[PDB]
Amino acid sequence: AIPFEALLPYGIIFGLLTAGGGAMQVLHVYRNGGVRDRFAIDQWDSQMMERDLRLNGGQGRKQVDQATAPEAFKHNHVWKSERPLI
């Protein structure tokens, strides 16, 4: 009936794309530090991510929950100086 030989190269196509997606998801989670990626980032959420990198201390999305902010937090604030745009 069903030829196994005809569907084996489909089987390897299926397995290669499956293993690629799984390995890539674990690579993304290892990059984030144990959580999922953010798949659609606003200008607001871009500004919110840079604010939380400023607040947590170095780490990407450690996500501190503290009462009142630290001492170096009032002084590590950033402006961006962009070039002449010639």
Ligand X SMILES: CCCCCCCCCCCCCCCCCC(=O)OC[C@H](COP(=O)([O-])OCC(O)COP(=O)([O-])OC[C@@H](COC(=O)CCCCCCCCCCCCCCCCC)OC(=O)CCCCCCCCCCCCCCCCC)OC(=O)CCCCCCCCCCCCCCCCC
- Residue 74's binding partner among other proteins, ligand X, none (Cβ under 5 to 8 angstroms by kind) is other proteins
Cα 85 to chain centroid, rounded: 30
| Nearer residue to ligand X within complex by CB, 6 or 86 | 6
Binding status of residue 34 toward other proteins by CB under 8 A:
yes
Q: What angle do CA 39, 80, 37 make, to 5 degrees?
A: 15
Binding status of residue 67 toward ligand X by CB under 6 A:
no
Q: CA distances (Å), 85 to each of 16, 43, 77, 78, in order?
A: 45, 22, 24, 21
| Nearer residue to other proteins within complex by CB, 58 or 81 | 81
Note whether 43 and 19 are within 8 A (CB): no
Q: Measured from the CB of residue 17, what is the shortest distance to ligand X in angstroms?
A: 11
Interface positions with ligand X (CB under 6 A) = 1-2, 4, 7-8, 11, 14
